[PDB]
Amino acid sequence: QIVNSVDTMTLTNANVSPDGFTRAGILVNGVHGPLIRGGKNDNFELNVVNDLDNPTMLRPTSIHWHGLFQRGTNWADGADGVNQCPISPGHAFLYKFTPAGHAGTFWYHSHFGTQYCDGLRGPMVIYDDNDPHAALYDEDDENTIITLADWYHIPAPSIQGAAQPDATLINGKGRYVGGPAAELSIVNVEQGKKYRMRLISLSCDPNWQFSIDGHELTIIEVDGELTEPHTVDRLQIFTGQRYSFVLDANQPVDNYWIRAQPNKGRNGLAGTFANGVNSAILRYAGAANADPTTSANPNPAQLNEADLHALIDPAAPGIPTPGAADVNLRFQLGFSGGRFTINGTAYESPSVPTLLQIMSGAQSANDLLPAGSVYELPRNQVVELVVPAGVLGGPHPFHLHGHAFSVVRSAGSSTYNFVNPVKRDVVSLGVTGDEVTIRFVTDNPGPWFFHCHIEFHLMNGLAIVFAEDMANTVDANNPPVEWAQLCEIYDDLPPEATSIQTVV
Ligand SMILES: *[C@@H]1O[C@H](CO)[C@@H](O)[C@H](O)[C@H]1NC(C)=O
Ligand SMILES: [Cu+2]
Ligand SMILES: [Cu+2]
Numbered sequence: 001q002i003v004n005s006v007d008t009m010t011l012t013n014a015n016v017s018p019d020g021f022t023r024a025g026i027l028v029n030g031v032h033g034p035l036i037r038g039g040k041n042d043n044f045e046l047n048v049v050n051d052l053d054n055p056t057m058l059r060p061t062s063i064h065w066h067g068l069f070q071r072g073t074n075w076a077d078g079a080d081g082v083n084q085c086p087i088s089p090g091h092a093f094l095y096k097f098t099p100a101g102h103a104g105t106f107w108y109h110s111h112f113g114t115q116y117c118d119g120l121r122g123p124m125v126i127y128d129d130n131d132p133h134a135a136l137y138d139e140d141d142e143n144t145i146i147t148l149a150d151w152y153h154i155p156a157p158s159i160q161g162a163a164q165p166d167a168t169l170i171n172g173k174g175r176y177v178g179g180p181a182a183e184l185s186i187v188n189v190e191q192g193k194k195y196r197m198r199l200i201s202l203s204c205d206p207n208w209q210f211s212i213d214g215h216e217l218t219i220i221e222v223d224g225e226l227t228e229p230h231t232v233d234r235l236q237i238f239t240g241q242r243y244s245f246v247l248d249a250n251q252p253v254d255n256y257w258i259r260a261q262p263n264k265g266r267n268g269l270a271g272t273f274a275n276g277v278n279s280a281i282l283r284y285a286g287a288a289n290a291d292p293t294t295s296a297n298p299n300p301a302q303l304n305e306a307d308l309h310a311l312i313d314p315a316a317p318g319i320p321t322p323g324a325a326d327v328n329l330r331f332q333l334g335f336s337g338g339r340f341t342i343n344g345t346a347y348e349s350p351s352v353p354t355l356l357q358i359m360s361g362a363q364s365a366n367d368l369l370p371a372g373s374v375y376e377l378p379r380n381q382v383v384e385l386v387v388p389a390g391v392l393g394g395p396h397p398f399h400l401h402g403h404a405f406s407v408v409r410s411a412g413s414s415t416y417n418f419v420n421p422v423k424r425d426v427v428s429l430g431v432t433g434d435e436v437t438i439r440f441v442t443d444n445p446g447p448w449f450f451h452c453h454i455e456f457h458l459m460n461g462l463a464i465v466f467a468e469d470m471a472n473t474v475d476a477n478n479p480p481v482e483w484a485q486l487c488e489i490y491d492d493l494p495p496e497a498t499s500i501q502t503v504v
């Protein structure tokens, strides 16, 4: 089912069984993660009605529209503690924004705690009526979207120890090791046509190696940013990254396995495809309703992010020399006292959201809470951030709210590209020795989150806040009166309203 650009999103709890194990989950308009779609100039008005009442998972909510820059609408960006206070059970909040010409493949997810891990997440596609790559494919619709999701048999708040997915969900469906032969997702194609497949990771943690038996993947988009066409057999996708790839249905009519192998999971999930776990079906019209019997490519050409190149306005901003940006920041990641830190500080959410602190009179980073996690950025300048990998629990996929950035230096590469680098909004920091360097221009007044997108790391402190262009933040953003009321309502909630019932 589909949600339109002006619509209501009613959030409820119900039982779900995407892998044949039934447990309670979170539904949006009676559907597990429905598609949100519109056009690049639409004005979105999304009324989010929080009717959640199951105490085994988070009830208060906050929706993030991942990849949208939210210029002038920082109050609708959805990171609780930064842009808003949570929407409380029994209440509604109207988000109003526009893509402002930015087309691409995105996704929406709750930004509150680990609630998105329990299913409050889904694909969001913004179509371009002038798409630059329209000559490259014939079909692009609700049937060419492929979402990847990690799924747990117990509610996220009850996970004890290091999280390990029970299953990989492809378009909401999949199987777990030792589980029943639950229905697999089918992606239908016709021999001779070309399809713009939109691949989205909805993950709370695991990354996947994705490939389709017998077919190549011609990448033409990354994280809502178009690239020169670049063909590969297999790619590694991290939390919240998106790729559009042209699928050329040029093989014999047949059933082909679609494969998404996780880096971790219960009972051997990471190492097998046995019984159709970690799988979906690519079916050519005319093939029987049966399982594929194909096999993966033994020696795949692997996607390397430094091979991706931006199609439009390719050059990285600023002087084309490492360290020659207007503002040059280097962050030191750490893990101390059971908490991740950045430059010695572990992120903890303030009781007054940064945007509300700024609207209330804060004039500089020194006045903002929490102390040690907030970095001020000047207006209209070129920034270069460097975030060396090394810290445990990686690879850590960092994301920046409010901006897309050029990746002048990717993981696994020791070279810099200022002429043509891919532009994206979620980047892997790699492994020990890597020095991922990104660039962006500070053209979007407001407080924006910068943090690891593995939700278990975010909740243990791996986050910082950029207070960008503080002098123009009040003029640029003008939240509705309901926005400021969220905090009053939420601070007044009774203890039974936010209490988490654990399960074993
Ligand atoms: C943080 O710490 C590193 C290591 O001391 C230092 O080199 C870097 O300049 C610091 N970054 C910020 C933004 O303070
Ligand atoms: Cu996200
Ligand atoms: Cu991380």
Ligand SMILES: [Cu+2]
Pocket: 064, 079, 111, 399, 401, 449, 451
């Ligand atoms: Cu975020």
Ligand SMILES: [O]
Pocket: 064, 066, 111, 399, 453
């Ligand atoms: O996020």
